[PDB]
């Protein structure tokens with residue numbers, strides 16, 4: 001129940017990445033979540049390969065690389081593959097390539113994941129604070145989202161149907177307006193040094209709590 005959290009303060013969050021024209025938000029959200037679990041378990045912060053997912057977690061996992069995917073099935077891949085690579089060994093090139101996974105350069109591992117219940121921002125607050133950063137889908141289809149610079153983001157035409165993957169690294173409030181602290185993979189020059197604060201407890205605003213999920217290492 002702590003009023004506000006920020007996983008950057010605990011050293012569990014990597015640099016803000018840049019997905020470019022390639023629509024791999026799902027991959028970045030997934031690697032982002034795990035990065036923290038890797039830090040909580042081993043004390044090391046290393047950026048995990050988003051490309052490894054784009055190239056290797058494909059048809060079998062209902063994913064289509066640069067044309068979208070799911071964080072849930074990405075975790076499944078990492079479990080099935082018994083590991084993921086470091087971004088340094090398998091870097092991001094913003095396009096669909098052949099699977100080039102090398103276990104020699106295995107950076108981390110995943111044991112299971114957990115899909116949090118639909119639209120429950122209270123449960124999402126619990127997970128974020130107790131378990132760590134949570135991969136979520138949101139409705140980023142509107143210009144206001146692209147244009148976002150600062151403060152608590154609220155779009156009245158935003159639906160609960162999610163198309164874009166992001167990572168909830170914290171929560172809190174600004175002048176009474178509650179927010180979710182979301183790391184976005186759209187470069188450092190998006191919003192607040194690559195982050196966006198989005199309205200919290202305003203009826204699952206933009207589908208933030210629609211499909212939340214987090215991995216775990218054991």
Ligand SMILES: Cn1c(=O)n(C2CCN(CCCn3nccc(-c4ccc(Cl)c(CNC(=O)c5ccc(F)cc5)c4)c3=O)CC2)c2cc(Cl)ccc21
Nearest residue numbers: 026061062063064067068069070073137162163164165211
């Ligand atoms: C082929 N295949 C699947 O597609 N799934 C599933 C993959 C995901 N699940 C979970 C449904 C929950 N959910 N519903 C709606 C929207 C999202 C969602 C969450 C985050 C983001 Cl970023 C997005 C956006 N993704 C896309 O727009 C997108 C995804 C894939 C793609 F190819 C193109 C676009 C959606 C979600 O997770 C259902 C079926 C399978 C499951 C099994 Cl056991 C076996 C084969 C499967």
